């Protein structure tokens, strides 16, 4: 078969389709129109967008395809370097860092992050307890305060103190600007037009703000009487069992920036989407709130208690099904090969996995794919292989999956124990793209349950 | 005065709530050498139950066995103390709190067989060289099976045997398992009183197989000693294997439940009796009950004879120890009735067994299969497949125990 | 700080309804930590399809009237019919929790999993182990365990020398 | 008293949560605390000054 | 000092209570009587916090 292709613009081919503030949502609409596979061409460049579990299960065969750096990821390597996220699988620094840092996400490590996660989660619950009547909550803004602080503290013993700030932290402002620019670059026909001279200048200055903060974390630790037995301890001290070598200084700096960003942005997104879907599905909200009350009997949650929050877990996975917050990953053909018995590929050919469309495959999920139904995840075993991939694939899957989920589950559990929520504006979903996805402008009001306090006497 | 109960962890793990005993009485006859108790328990608004549900009971260790421990360690019951480790603890102990010895001792099992960890701990504190050799002998595979596990030899009995083992109380307590709940088959129907449940408890008692004096089963003797107005910590437990009456009250039932095995069938009987009083028609229901003697352990005789008089059941008894009669067990009676029982199962009867799972249940099962084989002139393999199919249809249910 | 030698990946999965198999699993993961592994504990039907293609996977499970426990059903079903997504690379071992009081069904689920895993490409590093609750469950559990650590020892690397009591970890008051 | 403690705990926490070598702007933080204390004790109103990086408007 | 057994038993007898009965008090009002309030504590140990033979007030 010859594969479908969306509308073209003469010599620019499909490039102008990416001249939009919401390019993943545009791609999704193209998929609905064209089906499980389409070609996307730009001047000098081709990739193939996959949307069906039928093809994606083959794309996920690591003997035939490896992780590719998409254009997006190539632009982000400018600051992520050969950190774990933007390193090729065959670069020496990938497996070395993988081996050195995987022990930071072991069960024992996770147990040891719990107390610090609780620290930040208590800060978020308190901010909301302390609002006055009729004040409201900027949801993704507060979720970013919480997630950035949580990775800062758990990973690096560093306090961004985002809940002591009225604007976003400077690191977040430059992060968002840098991601925005990488995203806008995707559509640029002539990236060296001098019209983009200012764009590049702002880009370097944002890269600088982010690296200045990295330098501070490193300086604190050198001061840190440090056991701070955490991710940074492993970066500076662990040896890869294979080579016998530790990470060098340059790579460690890329790891820190990588983990500060990957370690919070997409978790912020998930919590924001999860709260969004709960307020729009009051019966689901009540069922989740019931579990929180039932399970979380103590003044702060325990590790074992968070693991007890099954339905909350289901809520989060269902939010990731509809709106996976890192919505695409890319693969390349290790050798000539045929996809689906119908689409020949040559060695090196690129594929994009369009995760939100995979997550809407009616052959897997049934006809009601737009509904928010956490019950889909009541037995996760039931889900076929490669049908649900919000954390990517294989040895290049998300290293921080358990950390994100533990944090999200803890936080959402606390929110649901401690407050009633109101969608007071009847908020219309508006999805902001910064390569990653997040609701923009989402606001709610939260009425404290005083876990009960109203007390009189006079 | 929140006159309140420890909500020990296990009580929280099982959703056990605290509540009152409304009745407690003996079921065997005056002069029986054995005891079987009937307790009625009140349930709070939040709890509810169904026929064939179990009561989970968090028991307390009795005085005799608590005193044996405080005596071995030279401690006063009331001595307040505080533990600590840093290490996890299935033993679910209040750590970093002050708590008396006697109350610490209500968190742990005092008569589980001695474990290999326990034996090593004792060996290491033993300054009696031949006594250390003996405790270590017990670690070997064969000795451990034959002298520890076969006789249920406990750490406590070995500490009493070895008074110069320098183990100390706080190390003792920490090496013990957490106290476990005991399950009892609710012997009443919620159709008679939704907020009140009964249990039927055979009292474990005898010469200890270990050789150290007299043995008493922890929960059963705790339950036996409770009285009207005492409190009790329990929860409702529903078994994975459904053990309920058919949906249609004309579907025929065969019930086999000797001894305390009658328990859940007393609930069945009470349910059918209410359904009748509501105008529903009832089909055949055969209850095979067995005991030593009507002079001794024929539990609920009056109720079961009345039920039978009101057409709620047909009652078939077997007595093991009646002077001038052969020793009779339910399976012998079942076998006489084979033809009839098998015709009933051919017409869609449910079959139920309750009670002893180690000897009685298997023998009852073998007799049912043999009745089938004889009636339908088929092989033992065909009879086994028949029973397998009966179970897969949901018509052959067991509520049996080794206890 | 500990000493963290191996640190090889040991995933322990359980199938349990009343916790016997689940405690055995967590006990194993506790002795692994003492032997430098990087153990992980989870139910069986939660890694249904996600068997570790590296290290090893200890599988501790009971049987209920010939059937898998409630948290293991998805795993086995996935295992039974589904075989396409082969189990090659997965170096495992199976420990069985059963009761002789269950006649014809004795250890049927552990057995199923063990042998099924092998008729799909097994790296069975250590022969299955059985526990009879009706007799000497700690004997057999002990036999299988010691033999087990060594089988996997020799197989890969060589972290504990005698637990070096990475065990005694009292904590009291 | 209880409401004064509420704000005082917010000030101690901000300082507990600073990183090594960060410093404290004293009169700025004392104003966060005193304005919030009269707002809360006097009027059940939360200025939330410790959630702001600049002075409250 | 501690109150002796004889006098503790006279109290539990008068109230029909068991020594070991755990209970929990509460008031809202101050208490020179320096009682563990909002804690569970047996009767017999509560009785070691108070004077049992002062003249009746
Ligand atoms: C699903 C289920 C339902 C049940 N329903 C009932 C019921 O309705 N009524 C009922 O009475 N029981 C019932 N049981 C059994 C019950 O739960 C308890 O196990 C029983 O009461 C004994 O527990 P215990 O604490 O008194 O004795 P424990 O202290 O636990 O001691 C029990 C152990 O002691 C052993 N033992 C017995 N005699 C001696 C001896 N002389 N020397 C040394 N060891 C000895 C027993 O074999 C058993 O291993 C049920 C059990 C189950 C699993
Ligand atoms: C819901 C939250 C998360 C989502 C949806 C997400 C998603 C993803 C995806 C899709 C990939 C694969 C990318 C690719 O194939 O190009 C990935 C990789 C990665 N993730 Fe996550 N992630 C989340 C949370 C986190 C957290 C909390 C951390 C850090 C603690 C983190 C760290 C990383 C790292 C370092 C990689 C690269 C791993 C490698 O290739 O070695 N992620 N993530
Ligand atoms: C209702 C029931 C059915 C059982 N069926 C079997 C069985 O088919 N095969 C077996 O070997 N053991 C059987 N057992 C014994 C259990 O597997 C044994 O108690 C196991 O140790 C319980 O493990 P768990 O607490 O993790 O669930 C059964 C036990 C019960 C209560
Ligand atoms: C058209 O090309 C695109 C468009 C959007 C895209 N979004 C992505 S998602 C890429 C991504 N994934 C995971 C993490 C953890 C992450 O860290 C911030 C990023 C940037 N890739 C894209 C490629």
Coordinates of N, CA and C and ligand atoms in Angstrom, one line a residue, chain C residues 16-21 62-66 97-99 102 105-107, ligand 3:
Chain C
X16 N -1.9 -14.0 45.7 CA -2.3 -14.3 47.1 C -3.7 -13.8 47.3
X17 N -4.5 -14.5 48.1 CA -5.8 -14.1 48.6 C -5.7 -13.9 50.1
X18 N -5.1 -14.8 50.8 CA -5.0 -14.6 52.3 C -3.6 -14.2 52.8
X19 N -2.6 -13.8 52.0 CA -1.3 -13.3 52.4 C -0.2 -14.2 52.7
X20 N -0.4 -15.5 52.7 CA 0.7 -16.5 52.9 C 1.8 -16.3 51.8
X21 N 1.3 -16.4 50.5 CA 2.2 -16.2 49.4 C 2.7 -14.7 49.3
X62 N -0.2 -19.1 45.4 CA -1.1 -20.1 45.9 C -2.0 -20.6 44.8
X63 N -2.9 -21.5 45.2 CA -3.9 -22.0 44.4 C -5.3 -22.0 45.1
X64 N -6.4 -21.8 44.4 CA -7.7 -21.9 45.1 C -8.6 -22.8 44.3
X65 N -8.8 -24.0 44.9 CA -9.6 -25.0 44.2 C -9.1 -25.2 42.7
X66 N -7.8 -25.1 42.5 CA -7.3 -25.3 41.1 C -7.2 -24.0 40.3
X97 N 2.8 -22.2 47.1 CA 2.0 -22.3 48.3 C 0.7 -23.0 48.1
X98 N 0.6 -24.2 48.7 CA -0.5 -25.1 48.6 C -0.8 -25.8 49.9
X99 N -1.9 -26.6 49.8 CA -2.3 -27.4 51.0 C -2.7 -28.8 50.4
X102 N -6.2 -30.3 49.6 CA -6.8 -30.1 48.3 C -6.2 -31.0 47.3
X105 N -6.0 -30.9 43.3 CA -5.6 -29.6 42.8 C -4.3 -29.1 43.4
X106 N -3.6 -30.0 44.1 CA -2.4 -29.6 44.8 C -1.4 -28.9 43.9
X107 N -1.1 -27.7 44.2 CA -0.1 -26.8 43.6 C -0.3 -26.6 42.1
Ligands
LIG3 C1 -11.0 -22.3 49.5 C2 -9.6 -22.8 49.3 C3 -9.2 -23.6 48.2 C4 -7.8 -24.1 48.1 N1 -7.5 -24.8 47.0 C5 -6.3 -25.3 46.9 C6 -5.8 -25.9 45.7 O1 -6.6 -26.1 44.8 N2 -4.5 -26.4 45.6 C7 -3.6 -26.2 46.7 O2 -2.5 -26.6 46.5 N3 -4.0 -25.6 47.8 C8 -5.3 -25.1 47.9 N4 -5.6 -24.3 49.0 C9 -4.6 -24.1 50.1 C10 -4.1 -22.7 49.9 O3 -3.4 -22.5 48.6 C11 -3.0 -22.4 51.0 O4 -3.7 -22.0 52.2 C12 -2.3 -21.1 50.5 O5 -1.2 -21.2 51.4 C13 -3.1 -19.8 50.8 O6 -2.2 -18.7 50.3 P1 -2.6 -17.3 50.3 O7 -2.9 -16.8 51.7 O8 -1.5 -16.4 49.8 O9 -3.8 -17.0 49.5 C14 -6.9 -23.8 49.1 C15 -7.3 -23.0 50.2 C16 -8.6 -22.5 50.3 C17 -9.0 -21.7 51.5

